[PDB]
Amino acid sequence: HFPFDEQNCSMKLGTWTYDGSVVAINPESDQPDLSNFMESGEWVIKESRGWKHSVTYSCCPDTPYLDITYHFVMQRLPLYFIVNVIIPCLLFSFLTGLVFY
Amino acid sequence: IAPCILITLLAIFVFYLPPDAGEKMGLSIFALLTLTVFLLLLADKVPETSLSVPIIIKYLMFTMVLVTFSVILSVVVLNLHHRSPHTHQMPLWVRQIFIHK
Numbered sequence: 153h154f155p156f157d158e159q160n161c162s163m164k165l166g167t168w169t170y171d172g173s174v175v176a177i178n179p180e181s182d183q184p185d186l187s188n189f190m191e192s193g194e195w196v197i198k199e200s201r202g203w204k205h206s207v208t209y210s211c212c213p214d215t216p217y218l219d220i221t222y223h224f225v226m227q228r229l230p231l232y233f234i235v236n237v238i239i240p241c242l243l244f245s246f247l248t249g250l251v252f253y
Numbered sequence: 254i255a256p257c258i259l260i261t262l263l264a265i266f267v268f269y270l271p272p273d274a275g276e277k278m279g280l281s282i283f284a285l286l287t288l289t290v291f292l293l294l295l296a297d298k299v300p301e302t303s304l305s306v307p308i309i310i311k312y313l314m315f316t317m318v319l320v321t322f323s324v325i326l327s328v329v330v331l332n333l334h335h336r337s338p339h340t341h342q343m344p345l346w347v348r349q350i351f352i353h354k
């Protein structure tokens with residue numbers, strides 16, 4: 153849907169060498185802190201959220217692996233691509249049919 | 254800015270070119286082609302954000318719209334000029350407006 157595309161980019165964070173049985177990580181809040189976020193001139197953050205996940209593998213039934221994944225749903229601002237790309241294409245497409253007159 | 258002004262002047266002067274020269278289309282459309290070259294020039298310089306449109310981009314698109322309309326109206330003029338007398342009958346109101354008033 154570019155330039156009207158929405159993305160969902162995540163950031164998986166975890167203790168690389170420590171499993172959940174020795175180090176437990178917990179989210180500070182349900183959402184990322186956007187209090188000091190600088191407004192972007194190309195994207196708008198529609199949604200954001202952090203989720204904790206614990207995974208146990210068959211070979212390692214006693215060392216669960218924890219992670220916290222922050223996801224950001226972002227909607228592109230399409231004005232730049234509308235003006236710079238789409239409008240010239242529309243002009244050329246309109247001029248295309250004028251030959252038959 | 255100066256090339257855009259010059260191209261706009263040529264787009265104006267297309268309408269003084271006689272239809273029998275057979276050169277209106279070439280002039281107007283090559284003006285549009287040159288404006289496309291200048292769009293390519295600006296592509297490397299302008300900002301890429303979408304909160305508003307640069308005034309230079311507004312001027313460039315205004316110029317391209319002007320040249321597009323110059324092409325369209327030149328096509329209309331040529332259609333009138335090369336109109337077959339036997340197949341096309343001049344309606345009277347066309348006579349009263351464009352030959353008398």
Ligand SMILES: *[C@@H]1O[C@H](CO)[C@@H](O[C@@H]2O[C@H](CO)[C@@H](O[C@@H]3O[C@H](CO[C@H]4O[C@H](CO)[C@@H](O)[C@H](O)[C@@H]4O)[C@@H](O)[C@H](O[C@H]4O[C@H](CO)[C@@H](O)[C@H](O)[C@@H]4O)[C@@H]3O)[C@H](O)[C@H]2NC(C)=O)[C@H](O)[C@H]1NC(C)=O
Nearest residue numbers: 160161162199201202203204205206207221222223224225
């Ligand atoms: C953009 O993409 C991201 C992925 O990158 C999506 O994130 C997913 O969000 C959903 C919720 O919308 C998450 O699902 C939730 O997971 C919670 C945690 O479960 C994990 O942890 C437990 C404990 O360790 C494990 O047992 C479990 O297997 C998981 O590993 C749950 O607690 C949540 O349950 C709640 O919601 C459901 C559904 O409404 C209810 O039924 C429950 O009762 C409860 O209220 C829920 O299941 C998912 O895990 C996220 N994925 C990741 C990897 O982060 C975004 O949602 C997505 N954005 C959009 C808008 O599409």
